[PDB]
């Protein structure tokens, strides 16, 4: 149902060894709600339903792909579609572990 590939996956960068914090607030407004993490630079900003700071970040950086801290979906702002691919497996997994803990039935 998401796209199996997009031309912007090349811009997905290595996950920091620091890992991900799915409860990290928006870097601009500080909201705890509807945050996304940028898969290029790993700054965290809010979704369109709050103050739209991730969309603003896309506009001012050109960074393509972002991961939702709500449902762990990856969205590309250029393709205007959700994407799932091997390049996104590391981040989605580390995010899932941080969000739900290790005691989960989901394949890591
Ligand atoms: Zn915000
Ligand atoms: Zn970015
Ligand atoms: Zn794309």
Domains of the chain: 1-108 (3.30.40.10)
Number of continuous H segments (helices) and E segments (strands) in the chain? 2, 5
Rg for the chain (alpha carbons), in Å?
Answer: 13
37 and 44 Cβ atoms separated by less than 8 Å: yes
Query: 72 alpha carbon to ligand 3 midpoint, in Å?
Result: 17
- Integer Cα distance of 89 and 74 in angstroms: 10
Resolved by: X-ray
Neighbours of ion ligand 1 (CB under 5 A): 26, 28-29, 46, 51, 53
Ligand nearest 53 Cα, by number? 1
Residue 76 annotated as binding?
Answer: yes
Say if strands 35-38 and 44-46 run parallel, antiparallel, or are unpaired.
Answer: antiparallel
DSSP 34: S
**22-30: Cβ within 8 A, 24+ apart:** 22/69, 22/95, 22/98, 22/99, 23/69, 24/69, 26/50, 26/51, 26/53, 27/53, 28/53, 28/56, 29/53
Question: Could you tell me where the DSSP H helices lie in 17-101?
Answer: 53-61, 89-100
C-alpha distances in Å from residue 13, one per residue of 2, 23, 36, 38, 62:
20, 21, 15, 9, 14
Query: 11 alpha carbon to ligand 1 midpoint, in Å?
Result: 23
- Integer Cα distance of 58 and 78 in angstroms: 9
For 86-105, give one letter per residue: b (16+ CB within 10 A) or e: ebbeebebbbbbbbeeeeee
11 and 40 Cβ atoms separated by less than 8 Å: yes
* Tokens matching residue 56: 């603003």
* Tokens matching residue 87: 């390049």
In the chain, residues preceding a discontinuity (C to N beyond 2.5 A) are none
Q: What number of other Cβ atoms are within 10 A of residue 68's Cβ?
A: 18
């Amino acid at each position: 149902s998401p796209l199996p590939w997009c031309p912007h996956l090349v811009a997905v960068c290595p996950i920091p060894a620091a890992g991900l914090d799915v409860t990290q607030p928006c870097g601009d407004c500080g909201t705890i709600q509807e945050n996304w993490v940028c898969l290029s630079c790993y700054q965290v900003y809010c979704g369109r339903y709050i103050n739209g700071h991730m969309l603003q970040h896309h506009g001012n950086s050109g960074h393509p792909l972002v991961l939702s801290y709500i449902d762990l979906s990856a969205w590309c702002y250029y393709c205007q579609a959700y994407v799932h691919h091997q390049a996104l497996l590391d981040v989605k997994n580390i995010a899932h572990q941080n969000k739900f803990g290790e005691d989960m039935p989901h394949p890591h």
